[PDB]
């Protein structure tokens, strides 16, 4: 059980980090577009 949940945690952390970078890019793009 420990092992199975640990993998899920690592999967989620990576997905979270990818999303933070995507959001940062999209906020920059929109700022530039509106400008």
């Amino acid at each position: 059980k420990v092992k199975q949940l640990k993998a899920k945690v690592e999967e989620l952390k990576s997905k979270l980090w990818h999303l933070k970078n995507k959001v940062a890019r999209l906020k920059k793009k929109n700022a530039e577009c509106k400008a």
Partner: protein, 35 residues
């Protein structure tokens, strides 16, 4: 033990859902501006 892991999965997944919502909104704004 597991409670700590299941809790962490819950906490990370919540953050992920909110970023997914933000990405969807930002993508909408970008599409509007670029079109």
């Amino acid at each position: 033990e597991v409670k700590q892991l299941e809790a962490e999965v819950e906490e990370i997944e919540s953050e992920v859902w909110h970023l997914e919502n933000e990405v969807a909104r930002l993508e909408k704004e970008n599409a509007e501006c670029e079109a």
